[PDB]
Amino acid sequence: MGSSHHHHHHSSGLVPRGSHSTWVTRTAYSSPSVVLPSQTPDGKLALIDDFREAYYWLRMNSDEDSKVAAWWDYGYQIGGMADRTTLVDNNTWNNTHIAIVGKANASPEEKSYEILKEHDVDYVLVIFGGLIGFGGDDINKFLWNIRISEGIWPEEIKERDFYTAEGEYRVDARASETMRNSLLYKMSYKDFPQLFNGGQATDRVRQQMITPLDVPPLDYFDEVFTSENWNVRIYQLKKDDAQGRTLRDVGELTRSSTKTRRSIKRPELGLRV
């Protein structure tokens, strides 16, 4: 549960920067609805677009199901790495994998919000920032070749850091514990400084935030449950080792349906071998 609505800009200009700057120059992606069939702002999330295609390229698998390819299929739609096949042959397992996330939130349970756009950028930083639970993704195999090339001046990082939270470092608890928990995991990854949990309520909600997937919307609750932020990235490892483990192989394999056609079409059916 949360609430927010104040962020929207673009990218264009000639200025320096340095090493990787996508995290802040790519997160701008934005998505107040991320409803493929409608919403579709500046398709950013480059650092994530390449991470999705890269994994879907080495694990594509195919077979009209995209088991381990579905999880990344969400980004393969454009694969900022070196594909961007416009989900032409993946639209089947791409439109049903990206629609579920935007359907669960709008479904009869929580409510359509920006939690969908924050999850996409959160899942990437959670799978690349921990690879399972802090440590693992110390390097990437497949990904864009450009590798940084200047862009929107450092106005997003300076404007996102200008904030100093509620106050010094007290009283952050209270009703805020719940109104901050959702605004802490989404601000800690977008801004950096956050996800501290005030009083004793915010901390309790952070540990209990993980949970399996009670609600029926396993597309809106599971997206943040595995993306959320450093909070979920750390709880995912302990949760995947104890309570759960296929949470990633259950939401990706669900894209299954048929076989021999997408590309693995045996030398007779698809007539392509």
Side-chain angles (χ1 to χ4, degrees):
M1 67 227 80
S3 168
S4 37
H5 47 103
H6 192 172
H7 50 91
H8 228 143
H9 308 90
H10 75 153
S11 39
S12 104
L14 294 86
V15 281
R17 175 62 237 193
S19 203
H20 64 289
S21 179
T22 43
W23 230 63
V24 286
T25 309
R26 113 256 204 236
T27 282
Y29 159 56
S30 127
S31 236
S33 349
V34 68
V35 181
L36 261 148
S38 35
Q39 222 62 39
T40 16
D42 298 307
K44 305 254 132 292
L45 266 31
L47 222 188
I48 115 180
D49 223 49
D50 70 289
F51 220 79
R52 304 264 115 176
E53 150 57 10
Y55 271 74
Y56 162 96
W57 189 103
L58 80 97
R59 239 305 100 159
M60 201 150 75
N61 242 134
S62 212
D63 210 348
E64 277 229 275
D65 151 47
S66 37
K67 28 147 60 264
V68 194
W71 182 17
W72 322 106
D73 188 6
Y74 194 111
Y76 170 52
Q77 49 143 129
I78 30 168
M81 171 254 151
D83 260 57
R84 206 224 301 163
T85 71
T86 326
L87 68 147
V88 55
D89 251 78
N90 242 224
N91 156 80
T92 157
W93 330 121
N94 183 104
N95 199 95
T96 48
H97 183 65
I98 299 185
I100 48 107
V101 154
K103 273 296 213 148
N105 207 19
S107 120
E109 254 307 315
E110 175 76 346
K111 153 167 246 169
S112 6
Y113 237 137
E114 301 244 36
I115 58 86
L116 313 151
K117 85 92 212 229
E118 83 96 58
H119 114 68
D120 205 19
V121 199
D122 269 325
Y123 221 148
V124 52
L125 49 83
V126 156
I127 224 303
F128 171 54
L131 185 138
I132 170 138
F134 205 74
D137 249 305
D138 210 88
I139 192 170
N140 32 39
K141 272 279 166 139
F142 259 35
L143 60 145
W144 24 252
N145 238 116
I146 174 142
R147 190 240 267 286
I148 105 190
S149 184
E150 302 184 349
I152 180 64
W153 40 51
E155 183 122 43
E156 218 59 11
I157 316 106
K158 197 189 147 112
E159 175 47 34
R160 283 296 125 189
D161 206 18
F162 179 46
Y163 263 58
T164 46
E166 254 233 282
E168 273 131 298
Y169 213 96
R170 68 184 302 163
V171 108
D172 44 25
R174 222 202 260 184
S176 314
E177 307 143 337
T178 52
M179 205 143 90
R180 292 273 173 281
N181 100 283
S182 278
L183 286 166
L184 275 248
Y185 323 153
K186 72 103 77 72
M187 281 194 81
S188 145
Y189 95 86
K190 92 197 260 114
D191 320 296
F192 269 62
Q194 232 56 275
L195 212 140
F196 287 123
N197 322 101
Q200 199 83 89
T202 337
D203 198 359
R204 178 151 63 160
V205 179
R206 140 183 145 176
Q207 201 197 297
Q208 199 130 49
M209 242 301 108
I210 164 50
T211 18
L213 43 98
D214 31 280
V215 308
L218 277 68
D219 334 316
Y220 132 72
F221 232 48
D222 206 47
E223 82 186 35
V224 189
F225 269 20
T226 318
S227 77
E228 246 205 7
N229 214 6
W230 181 94
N231 235 349
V232 135
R233 95 172 41 196
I234 299 291
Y235 285 143
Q236 176 191 359
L237 209 206
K238 80 175 297 116
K239 189 53 56 178
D240 287 3
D241 264 284
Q243 251 82 105
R245 41 137 214 162
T246 330
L247 74 166
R248 62 244 289 283
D249 251 76
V250 297
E252 67 183 356
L253 209 161
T254 176
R255 263 47 264 196
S256 74
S257 221
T258 353
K259 278 105 72 176
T260 43
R261 225 65 176 74
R262 219 71 268 163
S263 148
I264 204 174
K265 53 206 117 68
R266 40 135 49 78
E268 168 251 280
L269 262 165
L271 229 180
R272 216 270 121 176
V273 192

